[PDB]
Amino acid sequence: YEKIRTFAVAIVGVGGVGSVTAEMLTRCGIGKLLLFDYDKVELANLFFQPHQAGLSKVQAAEHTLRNINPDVLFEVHNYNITTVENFQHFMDRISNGGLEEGKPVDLVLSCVDNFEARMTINTACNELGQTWMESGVSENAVSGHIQLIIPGESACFACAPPLVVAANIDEKTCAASLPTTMGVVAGILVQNVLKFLLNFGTVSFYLGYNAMQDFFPTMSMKPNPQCDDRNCRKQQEEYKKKVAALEIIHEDNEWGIELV
Amino acid sequence: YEKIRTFAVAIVGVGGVGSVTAEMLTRCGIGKLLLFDYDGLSKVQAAEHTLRNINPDVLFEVHNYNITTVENFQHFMDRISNGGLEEGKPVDLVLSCVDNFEARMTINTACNELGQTWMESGVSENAVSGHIQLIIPGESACFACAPPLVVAANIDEKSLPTTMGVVAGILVQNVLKFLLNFGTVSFYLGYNAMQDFFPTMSMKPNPQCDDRNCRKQQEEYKKKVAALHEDNEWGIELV
Amino acid sequence: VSFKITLTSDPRLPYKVLSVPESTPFTAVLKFAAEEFKVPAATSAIITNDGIGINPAQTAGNVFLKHGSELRIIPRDRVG
Amino acid sequence: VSFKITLTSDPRLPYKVLSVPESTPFTAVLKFAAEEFKVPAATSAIITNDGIGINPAQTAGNVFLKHGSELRIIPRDRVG
Ligand SMILES: [Zn+2]
Ligand SMILES: [Zn+2]
């Protein structure tokens, strides 16, 4: 429904997953997208065209998407959100860059390719109490997932850190099927966006994709009461407070068929 | 791998599902795509212009005609049989991304006659559902093996972008698993978007299928089958 | 006379038991079952427990005799 | 202490039982279990049966005491 036009979604990372995700939401008639990325488009490493090489991914994406649907509003920022100056600007725009300026975005989507930037988004979202969806694809394209983080209500990304985040190892490490796996993940990502914003069907808190065996596990991960992120813990406190204070028409039946 | 460049894929229907599917295979470096659809340019020509810009090294053969008419049916079969990467060889796969049962039945009829493997895809009207299906004629169920009520009963046929992208993606993934021999190819994979439920099945041929070529293919298949820790410092024990 | 018809596309695999006269075309049983499941009749198909497709243009009596009571509706999604 | 560790991303939900000294950092248990499942250790995370996320930077003894034996590895897919 045209409720979709009343919502704003921020997308961080407009590479494989995010560029498809942006296209899908644009085609759905989302009120507004906010796009955040720093890389350029390259002939080396989905969505972009060759003649766009050397443009910033966010500008290139904006140029294409505006023409696909002229009624969608776009705000784009070509910067690295993990630097100290840009972090504050990032939070400002999550808080005020909604469909109506001065209101927050309805959702942030993480389509970045590294844990550092996931941790940055997580840190912002926990401070702001902003709901977000995280997405990812494995290195070998065999696997991917989406996850819904409502800070305080479901697990944040620091609640269950991967070994490298937990163990403080520096991030220090394409397959033909990468573009396809990215498309599947983007599609289930956006489907979850719509279910969430429009309140139809069941929103997944977690949905995996194992492309080898076509296995799509769902689960719902709960917040870690001892999560490293102190704003996660504070959100958990606020959530608990908030919870404590809040047919069949058969056109014809000629043949006498009986429901037993 | 660069095995992908040695293959040809026919796509019938370049609307929502087929256009994404054509794009994914173009980006993958497929050797050749054959596009069939029926309507200033035609949908297949528009699709070809976009795809050629994306990857100039993919070969394209496009046909703007309705495959269900008597003349075009023979040309369709001709091209499935001879329009592979090397002319005179068949395509490696046909994909159905059409929007109607008539055209699925035509593709089915051609594939059963030729013994051509194909994948079928679809999306529901309300975007709530979709699927993909592998038809190897004689080995798995053909489309006529389990006809929908309207086909069986001889009645004339008389959020979407997201569901189409999921179905196209899982479709292509199956294509690559099939052509490149990695993972497990699904014979059937559904998608229920309301509940995120993705059931797999492997549907077998109907021995009394209306398609007599399906039956003969089943005979030939049965015959063919009848012819044959760098460290462990902490003492952790696997119990 | 009686079939247990399962909806394959719903993770709860719900089922309906339908008692039917032997002369009833099974196309009407299918429709009736699709209506009970609130899925579209026109695009539904029917398979057995072994996953063998069934052409529903035959009598309920014959479907019963050839395949028994345990049948399964699958969607045949039409758009592309 | 003993843990039953289930791989969530494989439809067979296979599991491994690991007996470990209490003082072992649970990071080494996770790695050991990822290796047994032939999935990458670096990107794996660990949760309980209720789906409560666990920071594995603590002892096996404390993991056991706070969460018991039944734990679940999840991938943390890194590319986007
Ligand atoms: Zn947390
Ligand atoms: Zn058949």
Swiss-Prot record, chain A:
Q: Work out whether the entry's keyword set contains Secreted.
A: no
Superkingdom of this entry's organism? Answer: Eukaryota
Q: What is the effect of changing residue 118 to A?
A: Abolished ability to activate UFM1
Give the UniProt keywords, A-Z. ATP-binding, Cytoplasm, Disease variant, Endoplasmic reticulum, Epilepsy, Golgi apparatus, Intellectual disability, Membrane, Metal-binding, Neurodegeneration, Nucleotide-binding, Nucleus, Phosphoprotein, Ubl conjugation pathway, Zinc
- The residues responsible for catalysis, as annotated, are 174
The entry describes its oligomerization and partners as:
Homodimer; homodimerization is required for UFM1 activation. Interacts (via UIS motif) with UFM1; binds UFM1 via a trans-binding mechanism in which UFM1 interacts with distinct sites in both subunits of the UBA5 homodimer. Interacts (via C-terminus) with UFC1. Interacts (via UIS motif) with GABARAPL2 and, with lower affinity, with GABARAP and GABARAPL1.
Q: What is known of its domains?
A: The UFC1-binding sequence (UFC) motif mediates interaction with UFC1. The linker region is required to activate the active site of UFC1: it region moves next to active site of UFC1 to reduce the amount of water molecules in the vicinity of UFC1's active site and thereby elevate the nucleophilic activity of UFC1 active site.
Q: What is this protein called?
A: Ubiquitin-like modifier-activating enzyme 5
Q: Which organism is it from?
A: Homo sapiens (Human)
Organism lineage reads as:
Eukaryota, Metazoa, Chordata, Craniata, Vertebrata
The portion of the full protein included here is 68 to 346 of 404
UniProtKB/Swiss-Prot annotation, chains C, D:
Q: Does the keyword Nucleus apply?
A: yes
| Keyword set includes Ribosomal protein | no
Provide GO CC annotations from the record: cytoplasm; endoplasmic reticulum; nucleus
Q: What induces it?
A: Up-regulated by thapsigargin.
List the Pfam families. Ufm1
| Cross-link Glycyl lysine isopeptide (Gly-Lys) (interchain with K-? in acceptor proteins) residue location(s) | 80
Q: Which UniProt keywords apply?
A: Cytoplasm, Disease variant, Isopeptide bond, Leukodystrophy, Nucleus, Ubl conjugation, Ubl conjugation pathway
User: Mind telling me how this protein is modified after translation?
Assistant: UFM1 precursor is cleaved by UFSP1, promoting its maturation: processing of the C-terminal Ser-Cys dipeptide is required to expose its C-terminal conserved Gly residue.
Task: Name the major location.
Answer: nucleus
Cross-link Glycyl lysine isopeptide (Lys-Gly) (interchain with G-Cter in UFM1): residue positions? 66
What GO biological process terms are annotated to this protein in UniProt? brain development; negative regulation of apoptotic process; negative regulation of protein import into nucleus; protein K69-linked ufmylation; protein ufmylation; regulation of intracellular estrogen receptor signaling pathway; response to endoplasmic reticulum stress; reticulophagy
Family statement drawn from the similarity comment of this UniProt entry: Belongs to the UFM1 family.
State whether it acts alone or in a complex, and with which partners, per the record. Answer: Interacts with UBA5. Interacts with UFC1.
Q: What is this protein called?
A: Ubiquitin-fold modifier 1
Q: Which organism is this protein's natural source? A: Homo sapiens
For this protein's source organism, the top of the classification is: Eukaryota, Metazoa, Chordata, Craniata, Vertebrata
